[PDB]
Design a protein around this ligand. Sequence first.
Ligand SMILES: O=S(=O)(O)c1cc(S(=O)(=O)O)c2c(/N=N/c3ccccc3)c(O)ccc2c1
Ligand SMILES: O=S(=O)(O)c1cc(S(=O)(=O)O)c2c(/N=N/c3ccccc3)c(O)ccc2c1
Ligand SMILES: O=S(=O)(O)c1cc(S(=O)(=O)O)c2c(/N=N/c3ccccc3)c(O)ccc2c1
Ligand SMILES: O=S(=O)(O)c1cc(S(=O)(=O)O)c2c(/N=N/c3ccccc3)c(O)ccc2c1
Lengths: 11, 11, 11, 11, 11, 11, 11, 11
Amino acid sequence: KVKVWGSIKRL
Amino acid sequence: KVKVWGSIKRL
Amino acid sequence: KVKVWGSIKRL
Amino acid sequence: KVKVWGSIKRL
Amino acid sequence: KVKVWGSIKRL
Amino acid sequence: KVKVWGSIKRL
Amino acid sequence: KVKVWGSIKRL
Amino acid sequence: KVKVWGSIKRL
Ligand SMILES: O=S(=O)(O)c1cc(S(=O)(=O)O)c2c(/N=N/c3ccccc3)c(O)ccc2c1
Ligand SMILES: O=S(=O)(O)c1cc(S(=O)(=O)O)c2c(/N=N/c3ccccc3)c(O)ccc2c1
Ligand SMILES: O=S(=O)(O)c1cc(S(=O)(=O)O)c2c(/N=N/c3ccccc3)c(O)ccc2c1
Ligand SMILES: O=S(=O)(O)c1cc(S(=O)(=O)O)c2c(/N=N/c3ccccc3)c(O)ccc2c1
């Protein structure tokens, strides 16, 4: 299991 | 742009 | 960019 | 078992 | 420096 | 109830 | 409850 | 220098 926290440029 | 957070089961 | 943390069973 | 803490450029 | 992630019952 | 996140300089 | 992470200069 | 990773019951 991996947790993620950030941003993406598009959905 | 979208702020994104959560979990992923595997890479 | 995404900050990532968690566990992996094997390399 | 291995634990990870860092960043990735894309999901 | 310390980072926090959680909940509080009141402001 | 309130979800809270951020940074604190010292305890 | 709050998840907490960071650094402290000395005990 | 010491690094910390855990939880606290209140801010
Ligand atoms: O590492 S980043 O700089 O890319 C960064 C920065 C933020 S944040 O805006 O500064 O805190 C968020 C984030 N926060 N999102 C808000 C949700 C509700 C209200 C306001 C903000 C989020 O939910 C997920 C990922 C994030 C990644
Ligand atoms: O070694 S790195 O410099 O690449 C580094 C730095 C951070 S951090 O932002 O400075 O603490 C994180 C991280 N933290 N993520 C936040 C989660 C919620 C709120 C704010 C931040 C995370 O969950 C996983 C990996 C990380 C790797
Ligand atoms: O550890 S907890 O279970 O107490 C937990 C759970 C959440 S969350 O709702 O499931 O992701 C958050 C959180 N998220 N807040 C949202 C912001 C914008 C939209 C939706 C949600 C947040 O910004 C800060 C702390 C949180 C702590
Ligand atoms: O050892 S503990 O079980 O007490 C534990 C567990 C978690 S965790 O939620 O399972 O990964 C965290 C943590 N993670 N916090 C999130 C930040 C952003 C999004 C989701 C979660 C954190 O930033 C600091 C300390 C933690 C300590």
